[model samples]
Target: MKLSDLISRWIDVEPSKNAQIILRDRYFMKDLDGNYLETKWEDVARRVARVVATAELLNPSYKKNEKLDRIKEWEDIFFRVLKARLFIPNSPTLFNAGLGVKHDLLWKPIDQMTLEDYEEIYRSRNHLHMLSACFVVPVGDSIEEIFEAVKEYALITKVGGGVGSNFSELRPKGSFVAGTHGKASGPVSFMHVFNSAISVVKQGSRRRGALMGILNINHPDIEEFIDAKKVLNFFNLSVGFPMDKKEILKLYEEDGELELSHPRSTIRKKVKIRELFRKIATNAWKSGDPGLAFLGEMNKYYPLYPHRKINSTNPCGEIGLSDYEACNLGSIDVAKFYNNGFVDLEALQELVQIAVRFLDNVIDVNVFPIDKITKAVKESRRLGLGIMGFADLLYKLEIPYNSQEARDFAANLMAFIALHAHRTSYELGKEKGNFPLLEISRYRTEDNFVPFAMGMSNYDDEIREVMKMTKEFRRNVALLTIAPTGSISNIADTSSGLEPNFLLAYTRFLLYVNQVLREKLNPEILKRIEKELIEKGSLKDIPDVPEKIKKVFVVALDIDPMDHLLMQDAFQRYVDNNISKTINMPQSATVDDVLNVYLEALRTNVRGITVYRDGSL
Candidate 1:
């Protein structure tokens, strides 16, 4: 049961050529001579598993020999799931885990390690290896505090983590400044400075840092914030609205005005609400900036509701977080679970249980950039467990992406994941301990604290019953979130997170073709289809393509925009956290079309919506 013996029995799988390049340049650990240290894909998995499983030694109940046995057992389990490409954690986990630790130390037998060696190894895992990808830092109202936030942001970005913050507390443009006796610039101006700071901090030659800048909807400089993305290149902007659809509509009907004010000053201004709505839609249609964040919806489902408010979200807008809070994410390859003609529910359930435990361990071993972040992360212990390869699963089942059947299937699958994930967290609470802030959370007060409602899926009643039975203790605050699996999905060699195929062929290059169509059509017809796809970027205009093949091979632009919203809404019903999905629109889409989609999103269960017209970028 030594580490070397386990690695000797490891089986390796080949990834796509693009994935191979990404892994070598971005993920693999390298020595001082700029040479690759870990050569194979299995090597990366082994390093990650070994470092993560070291958390098992922290259990107080396990004796010396028992702790060593448990580490090997969990290491084998974690390595198998990762090697098979069934589940993959966030980018930071793969990049930062076990980076600077010496291989000589890891190759030693666990039972032979001395007490001092264990202490040194545990100290090596602190502050240097951060595994979480999502973080929200607080931006204060003064000059000194703002610069301090900037310094914290640079430190976090250096260790490969994304940061988000709300700038509503800053004074509006042209306001009086007490310190300088001069006029105060706006939040958008400060955003430019933050963007510049983020651009200089390179994440180990991989990519530039990312940030999410948010402003309140009733802020006086809302329009300026909406248009800031036109110039800024490193930040994603969002407008946070505290009111729901009913409240906004009532205000519009009564007086068509909204009051904008700042806390530091007594100045106020009233603007027409309808006019502001029109401007937001128009800017979104033009540049695809400033996505909507429904603060009321996010706070409604938040377990720590009135105790701590969620001010913003990560760069992609999946999970909402309070000041200095962070969450680690992982996704299961849904297409891998599809066996024969149906989904193998037994295998999916096992994967969910293991993934939940893996994410929870990440919080215990993660090294936060600041003390405040470390304290906040331990308080909630939030974990984001979601899925990728959904469109590939649909293609395997021969289902169109725009149909109602697809939505129903997605809902049922997500609900099944939620049920097991919540149950596993509850069981872990009994074994380990409850979260530190569980007493102040809504789960302690409400009897029905499940994520799904009455008519969400077939497992609604069963999910409610499980929550009722174990309502006293829960390990984590939230369970499920659908993140934008951009790079991790590539490593898994499957479709991206909850998105249809964007392109089957790009300019005489065949990237991905539907497996169902590949089996049905001959080689010559596929060649012709590929040529047509390269020419027009779609199969709709191919004369020899059959109607059934065309339907099953629809790309992102081929589906209606409303269908995108529907698909997102279906998955959001069972998720405790939010989701990151873009409603793709054609270039000919009007401003009114964008406004209507926003209205429809507010009516549904979706927490936020981002609209991207073709050619907007």
Candidate 2:
């Protein structure tokens, strides 16, 4: 057997102190004695590579080509990718893959599934199998059902998962409650109950618990739901806008009073649409709690559009999933694809194929806590393959994050990823089989570029010059996303997602400088950079530094709010599901500013907008 065949061995790769600490504290497997099983990063890489590569054995395409010994070849590539810090999967996958030990894998018929069955599902599922980081649950209207929803939330949270729920089902405040013959306390009151429960339920293996609360725009208690975050800090809230954009606007413009109805028409009240909108903006301005999701617009790009409805988004609001469906995501480090000073298209294409295969394998190996989630996930074969370190890439290319050049790069780069990913998925579909729902799914109707449009304008002529054929087949419904890579980016020593660097230096001293110097640079240039950093203490302090270069490292607070919207708009055109990014505002920013930005987002192609005013909440 090869050394990598053993979980105990791996290739040697040096990681930073912060990376080492992140691994030890969050990811590395613990022995029965509470000691970490792996000390070197190679050991962890081997564990992931061995198991994920073995998944190929189940593929008929792979089985037919056994003479090529592709399994071992893929295993080596997977290990190299991880060690090179070019890409990484979701947090759960990082910690759970190939964790050799006996554990649970539960699935049963709905009739046979019970409360005890659920409790059993959450307890230390296979050391090899893990639940996804996010889950979406539908809340029922009755008291018993509401409590059951809480139970589901607790179960998932106890096993380290983020959750989202829509509270539009409940009756409005002061409504009659037949059970106790007393008035109902309202949806906002119940939110407090859920928040308190979340506070007590420790997030299983993770350091944080995430919950998303959503309410419809026309709900009677919508005002109360809008103000939920003023006092509560435990849950993230978003307002789900009604589908009829023109109608809602017409009423708002006229300031005309309209009757608000509950989900099932159980309660009704009259309120002006304009007042309702202002309230949502005002509270959002005060506290960033209630972000807005254009439910009407979000559904337009749904893969199973008009067939399956997207009820809520994952913890960070990237991919929107149907109730009981979960998505497993991974990201390619865009900055690592910087060959010399240019973006390496060939390398990025290769990385996307590998990432798609790895994430698809994760879907099969995962042991979900509930069967509904298992069935929904498997049927669609949803895989959210995304990108990170975008700011780092822009800096390397010497382009301003807020410039037209950067926006064009964002659009074209994502389009390139989309084209390759679709081609790769189609190829895999022919090999593995298309997602079961693809026959009736409206997954890729919008993009009609014939694979690659004729263009040598921005990127190299190789893309436009290379003749290519187009096909309409894919194994997964949606493929690209821009996830908030909080943990993984730290390990990679780069900026997170599309956001600029938070600060010039790590202040742990030489942390940022040392990391930047490691990337490709001339020997003489590296020495000068080191000398400048050592003498000046910060990138901004270095003499002869271009202001444009310094601006590349600017914090979010210093950036124009429109630049954030512009970035989001640029990327949204190519994404199939949605994008997750925040528009950061300063403390002096007003309610009018928040309202204007939210309205501007509605006019754009993006599906959602979240504004964070510094010191707001």
Candidate 3:
């Protein structure tokens, strides 16, 4: 399509200005010649709808659509969800589905095949793979294993998937190397190699790449791992939770040293836990590198815990996965469930069930990148169904951000969604089958796992009755998460997952630079923020504005740190996966303020916390 014609069609679709700008430059479908093929937002949404709807035809457990109208029914529902901004899947589904492009191979060519025939096989590739955004890979302690991990990283990034790996098994710096009879380079040095490798493997046809590197807090080289991102810029870093609670308390008593051990026998170290914790705090307060994950606390609710160990998390720190595991994500726009200021609970329940079924179909139709990942994902069938537009919901309901009512409302709302999602999964289980892992699960016996049929037992008698009636199965090992949802929420024109508006209205300009290519641009542009002005909490000088309205709409930095923690803690009570939240502190915050929040999070039941001191970076 011509640029003029594309622009005309786009205008008629009536996309938000920010949403339109992002689509024009990056996401919309294009041809080999670089001209837009999907000329409007509706066209893009239709492509995703058709692709998802087709998967229903592949599920054998369901009744065959002999009339073929079932496909149309599902397609219509999917498209309506997108157009209504009721919910949206991750970015990959939006960009690659039904585009008639080949990102994954269609078939393998045999050795006897001719070059011309092989070319046809290559040309027949398609974008019908699963749309999971989170994946984890395990690394071993040898050169061969390291090289294999490098290939795995490239494979994931090449197909628009993000990867995470735990490096606790690698020996520390100065360890003996039998082959060379010299000191080893340690996990931190090897991390640099993985970081540099991602620079070459592009994210298929897009410009985005993602990775997460994790080390146990008790690793011999913990200090070195914490500072790796200060130099290497491609991958995010996190530290696994430290040893048991007893050791943690010993360190808090001004102890000089604590013993540490790794599964790799050669790995041992002695250090002050307080000192290490302080170093992490200082670095976070400075550059926000090396976020912390409470791995133990995270597993308290993990159905697969003690059976399949979880070592690390995806880049976004939401889904904690065992090695070679993946999970697909989708979120409902909470703001859209409102019925003139009151929540329409029935509408929310209907969408939750549909979203669960949609995600299950994705697992069945996925073309896994590696055999290990395919086996792991299929057995567990994990799904991440979360919510967006939470702040918008509060606004519509006229709830104050820091008030006790808002906190109570958050916990109660998540409990409601969690209840319905569990019942729906149970119904699906009765029709389909329980995830294979559930049968062999070491953590829970047949009777131990039965309570979930009624939304984990705390639900009311009416809802719990659904669970008792569900006598057959439960489809997934885990469900429900709260993602960052930054981009999708922008498309839906609402506040991002449990986060307040950053700025009501303002222009934001960022410099474009390419240091590796030695390319530079003329220094002129930089990045916007305004109604947006008030919503973003940018003005206290507007005397005419109501103080009450300003209090409810305060921006991230303007809100109290405790309020952020309370909200996250509330939702986490019912969330199967963790909550991705940031406690945005003002520039004036001291080390004491940071320490207070960190310590309190440990005492609370929340899985994790990220504290960012404003203007620190």
Candidate 4:
């Protein structure tokens, strides 16, 4: 049960070349001498597994006598999944877990250590260990509170976490300040301060700091906030629209007015809602800033709707979190489940069960930076279990990314994952206990409080029946999100989350095209195709490539923007949490095209939308 024994049992798993480089430069642990302590992929896996599995000792229902066996059993299970590349937790979990002084406590015998010892260890090493990737810190109106938030943001970023904040509560520009008897500097001005603080803090000394800044749509300085990204470099801006698609469309079509007000003062101003919306679309068309976060849509489906309001999202907009709340994310390389022409549903189900348990255990073992964050995280125990290698999955199935078949498959696949994930969480609640704030959530009252509806799939009746049987024993308040798997996907040697291949070939080498097409086509033919794909970044103009191959291997820009929206909506139907996807548009795409995509997104059930035009940056 010791870490050394676990390492002795670990067998080496070969990673792709790209994965090996990324693991060495970013994730591998080091000693004070700057030499690598964890040189093999299995070393990192064992470290994460050992740290996470230790949470078993903290479980209230666990028998103290069986601690060693329970820890070893779960550790082995976690290690196998990670070693096989079936599931990978977020970067922070891989980077900071078991690296700090808190991990030193694991060397002691579990039976000799009391629960109080574990609490003391966590508090002592609070700032050194952070296991979650996404966090939302509240920004108050006063100067004192603003600096406090800045300090908190720096700490979170230093430990490799991204932060989201809403600044609508601050007064607008030129407003009178009661304390100083001077004009207010506005939320946009304070955002620059936050951005500068982020720049100086590198995450884990390897990754740059990331932040998401949001302002209410009705704030007087909304226009400035939309354009702030033009000058600021470290922030991603979003407009928090208080209205749903229907209400916003009505105002936009009728050319009605919107009242903008200060959060503290009663001063108000009216602006033409149509023109304001046009400005947002125009800015996004030029430079993809100020993405829309439909506040009404987010709150409507949120589990703790009346009790807590979600004002902002994580850096990628995939997760909406209340103040001081953080969510740890992990993704399953779903492409691994594809065997021959069919999906291995049994294997996928088993992975989902283990994945949910892994993420829930992360909550118990995580070392939060502040007491407030610790309290908020324990209350809901939010977990974002998502997928990567989806585009690769499509390629294996020979389904075109833009076709209706692909959309239907996406919905069905996510529905299956959601069903099993929730079932596993329900089982955990039975074995362990429900999240602390379950009583305040909608599951206590609503008959239809399942994680996801069947939604054009065969899971409708089964999900509803599961709700009836286990409604009171739900574990996490929310589950399931689609994150933008950036580096992690590269480490997995697969396509990123919910996104089509960005390019089949790059300037350096042919990646996907070689992996997916080299064996199917003649070597000489593939050589010619790779040469052209590296130059063009697409297969549309290549004459040697077959039509069917081009259809199945469409890149991001090759597909229509509407198809992108539809794919996101398809998954959103089953995902209780939001998705992080960029609707890619060509360089020649007009502003009207971007505007139309925004309008269409409003019409669907998608929680949020972000559009990117090629070469916009």
Candidate 5:
């Protein structure tokens, strides 16, 4: 591949891939919609390329060793991220820069720009490099307010910002709406707006945007939030709920203590424990929405979100919010700890412990652009301690990323982290005391809310199969989570989330040399590195590479999406909360194929499923 072509593919900023058709003449930031707009692509590309070319021509040998200096700065930032639970520090460094053209795959929070918000965004001296937000209808007051909020969030997403929202504030079906002066059409009606907004946001040809929507268990509007996709397909929209609610409601129902609200209405009535249990299992069996949240657990950790009410989630679904809560994330390099080959328990633990501490500091030190974000974050004290390079960790262990062995390993990893994080937070609480709502949280604490992680992560099938063999006694808060694994993976120079490499010989950037190449940037750049590289290098000269290499180093696309889900199942066994996994089917895949995958997950106790086809994301 030529230098420019190689750079474009690696950085994912190539002209052909950047533009998307949002509306007629408009395009989504990075080809989020399926249409490929060339002129817009060229405009942006040429402008960017000119800057680089001019800089080089003026001084061909700029001898600052800028790359090494930057690497050192990255290393320092990485340590701080680990100490603070910052966005896992490996991705951007690994993927973005080197490529002449780079794609902004992961966004932090929803930009949620108003026409006013948008004007401020571009007008600023610096474009706030990473802007993210989630999509969902307003769960608060007034249509005009909601429409404006949703529109701004959508525009933010259109420009490649990852966004999140809460739908819990919306009135439930059959609830009174004085403003409409009529019976409310319900949350689902609004979700259509959300759905259409998602469609609009992804119209650009540059970068794909992400959106997350969340609802509280007790919200009058919840069930509709859960089933919103029944009529409208929020295929790419992530659904959220507190995971521990099942346990909390379980105890209430079993003991005939409290009433669980009608999932379909605002009215509340007494529920028998046995009946509620059946409903939960049945709903779970029937549909794959309402991915669980461990709110009760979250209460114990941060105590900030208050008991006010949770409504929506960001695209990745880990951070929960009431109206406009935003979360900043960083992950650990699971592969970094896999030395001398035995999971490196000590290194992993040390890194994680530090991450918990660091994330706590982030809550205090980091800037908050929104009031809701500041409120929810300080209230919840939320931090996502997740992993990047998990795929690589499994690969190095010779355990297939989707294999049962890999799944069990994933389970153990999460279980270990969950246990420690919970203990650590509790310990912090003892010193710092509990969050303000500790009293109310305690009421829901015991059986009301099972202590399970509210976060998300990967590798589950094997764990499920094994855990099904035994039941546990006590519950813990803090759940496992899985995010997009974007720039985080690049920073760590490792594989993403729980996914295997997408391709063996994919192109990437090299800003230092101003070229792109077909070589191992790191082990996780793509799946089956050694085999692909060997084949690419000696195909004509040697005419053949070892067959064993191909057998051993298979990549993700080479594997089935079912295997991906299965891997998720293995790790989920020990996880008390839900898992965030996407079971992607190509456009060639059929409805029957889709139905089968969904059914398979339900039968196996998988929490929820998001299916993205060619154009769905």
Candidate 6:
């Protein structure tokens, strides 16, 4: 294997974190000076070379083919280096032995097949199987039925399938059950079984199994569904809280909290929507779990509501779900807009255009997992184009993220991208076809540019964009989306997408090396930025971190969780897609705290939102 492969093996030894030397030891296995080590190296190298040779055969269509010919070609080339060591146990033989070869194939449709469909598609049931055959449960299903659903779900998960389920059918925690059941166990209780199954099945001995659970705001069980995480413990479990920006902001502030108090229309006993939501939030906050999803804003852009409620969601929690609805995701490097001492506005604009174009391309290139997915992709053509490394851009520009300037600058970038991306997508639709979702778009023309608010843009930009962009589309793509840039952000070399800078300096594990990689305490320090400790100069020698720096350069935890939601609102004005940001609150925060952030987000015109308390994610 290549040196990197050896390193990966080392990483696996120390699995979770801080284990590198194990790799060094494993690679050599014997004393470094021993001749046997050289023999092992050659064996590993030859095996890796074979893997690469085979992979080149499977790589996507490109203009040239010579690159995949042999090991010598692989050795010097950049992509080749990755190939040799790609296989494990090293399946170089199985994949490449028979037919034309290439890199590991993608699961054609990550998770699209229903349980019934799996009866045949799992033909041969090989590893890295395409599509996760997830199960579906009606809202009215009994607990026994729900358990059966999980059992089936576990089987699919065992073989590695991404799953999404709608919880709208599950009644609220207190609904009456006539099946000899006293108190209904509630959706949350069933969620535990699902969560447990995911944890047990895992993604076929590789990654953790993923799930997307969505509950409508109108559901009586929405409270229990949203709070499901509070009652469950599974690192692999990911929950989305679908609410509104205006509501997020309302929920964020104490006095500003939007009372989810909804009086029952028919019944005298009132169901305080706000109160229940707050309780859910409080529960999640204390546990650091559940992601937020903004239904109102998400719906505003896509126009999925009224026609159908989104009962399921994407594994990553970025795209909303409806029958035959799909969304394609792509992000850009915000740092791309930054240079030696200035912002590269034009270049950034061009890049945003490119990003939109690329996302547009993906819909065409991808083999939709199912007919529903294909139809959905064809219709709305839901696509997400966001920025990674926002903090890096600010830092390069010597701006703080929390500062007015930082927020304004971020807003400016979002607005610019929104305008250009919409124009670009529309122009592409002119060349191509508009997404079906655009049929309900603000500007639902054949041109395909549906515009919405940039939350931070306030009513003016929001109204203007919303007005100008709405065309003949019926909500072509329900809403534009912004997903948390975790892996993608790393490649972009920026702060996480839409996130405040993580600590400038913190010990982190590179999942690859597993050893602790020391992150710069103050990235600015590496920039050699400094000034005298004079009262008004640069911050220096202060015992406590400065308030401005704390606010501006502040990491997610530094700011009030509400600030995070506000930041989301700030950008939503210019956004046609919803933002995928998490609220980083202390674990000690109360359920009330979590609820406030959600309500506050909605009050602000913000669309879909997600939260990640200190430990939840």
Off by over 4 Å in 3: 1-13, 63-67, 99-130, 242-257, 265-267, 442-471, 509-537
- Cα lDDT, model 1, residue 127: 64
Candidate 5 lDDT for residue 578: 40
TM-score of every prediction relative to native:
0.94, 0.84, 0.85, 0.93, 0.55, 0.63
Candidate 4 Cα errors over 4 Å, as ranges:
1-13, 101-126, 450-454, 507-514
For model 2, the stretches where C-alpha displacement exceeds 4 angstroms are: 1-13, 64-68, 99-128, 178-182, 203-205, 242-259, 443-472, 507-545
lDDT, candidate 6, 395-507, per-residue tens:
65666665667667667767766666666655655544555555543453334334465445433444455445445312235324566655434422346677776554444
User: Candidate 2 vs candidate 5: which has greater TM-score?
Assistant: 2
Candidates 3 and 5 compared: the better one by lDDT is 3
Q: lDDT tens digits, residues 208-322, model 3?
A: 6688888988888888887765546777888887344334544665655756665544767788777787888877788777777877765555677667778888888888888
In model 1, which runs have C-alpha deviations exceeding 4 angstroms? 1-12, 106-120, 249-255, 452-454, 507-520
lDDT of 1 by residue, 323-405 (tens): 89999999998987776778878878887998998999888778988999999999999999999999888888878899999
Winner of 3 and 4 under TM-score: 4
- Ordered from best to worst TM-score, the candidate numbers read 1, 4, 3, 2, 6, 5
- Taking every candidate in turn, the Cα RMSD to the unseen true structure, in Å, is 3.3, 7.5, 8.8, 3.9, 13.3, 10.8
Provide the overall lDDT of each model, using Cα atoms, as 2-decimal numbers.
0.82, 0.69, 0.69, 0.82, 0.45, 0.48
* Top candidate by TM-score: 1
Worst 10 residues of 5 by lDDT: 511-520
Model 2 lDDT per residue over 1-617, tens place:
22122212222436777788878877776666888677766666666665566556557765544613665576677877877777788777777675443222121222343334322433334633663676788887778878888887777776667788777778888888777888887788887878888887864455566888888887888877887665456688888864744455556667888678864446778887667778877887787768877776666666676778886787678778788888887888887677667877876777778888888877766776677878998888877778888887887787777777888888888877776776677778788877888767754444432221223224323332221222246788777778788888877767787776655444551355434434434456446666665554445566565565555554565577888898888877766666779898878998888877866776667677788887886
| Candidate scoring better on TM-score of 4 and 5 | 4
Which regions in candidate 5 have their CA more than 4 angstroms from the true location? 1-138, 151-161, 166-209, 213-235, 238-311, 320-323, 430-433, 442-444, 447-450, 453-480, 508-552, 573-578, 585-590, 603-605, 613-617
